[PDB]
């Protein structure tokens, strides 16, 4: 499970709750769109 | 219906209401002009 | 001890407390992800 296309448009909270369900060890990083990585 | 030229200059609210009428499944993303995509 | 991979996802406070334990002379700099260095 490496991607969540179904999360586009949902809030950070909803997204956090979905990813932690599928990937309990996830380290969630929240950045502004356009942040150069 | 892939573009809304008639929405230039209108507020985000007005724009949201117009697009959802024409495209009920739209996932609306609001970014600052100039955000590098 | 030049890196702390175990700190990804933790808060700045927790991170500060961990690094100072391992490296008492550390000068801690806190920047936004994407700051061009």
């Amino acid at each position: 499970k490496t991607e969540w296309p179904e999360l586009v448009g949902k809030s950070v909270e909803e997204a956090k709750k979905v990813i932690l369900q599928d990937k309990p060890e996830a380290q969630i990083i929240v950045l502004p769109v356009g942040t150069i990585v | 219906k892939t573009e809304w030229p008639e929405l230039v200059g209108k507020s985000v609210e007005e724009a949201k209401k117009v697009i959802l009428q024409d495209k009920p499944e739209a996932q609306i993303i609001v970014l600052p002009v100039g955000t590098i995509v | 001890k030049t890196e702390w991979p175990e700190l990804v996802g933790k808060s700045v406070e927790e991170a500060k407390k961990v690094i100072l334990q391992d490296k008492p002379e550390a000068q801690i700099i806190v920047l936004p992800v994407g700051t061009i260095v």
Binding site: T2, E3, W4, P5, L7, V8, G9, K10, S11, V12, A15, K16, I19, K23, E25, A26, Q27, I28, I29, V30, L31, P32, V33, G34, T35, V37 | I28, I29, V30, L31, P32 | V8, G9
Partner: peptide, 24 residues
């Protein structure tokens, strides 16, 4: 650095997910 346990969320001005989240 590819980190198998990290998930970056790129948010819009209203904090909605703007792009498809992926591990890395």
């Amino acid at each position: 650095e590819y980190r198998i346990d990290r998930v970056r969320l790129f948010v819009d001005k209203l904090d909605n997910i703007a792009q498809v989240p992926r591990v890395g």
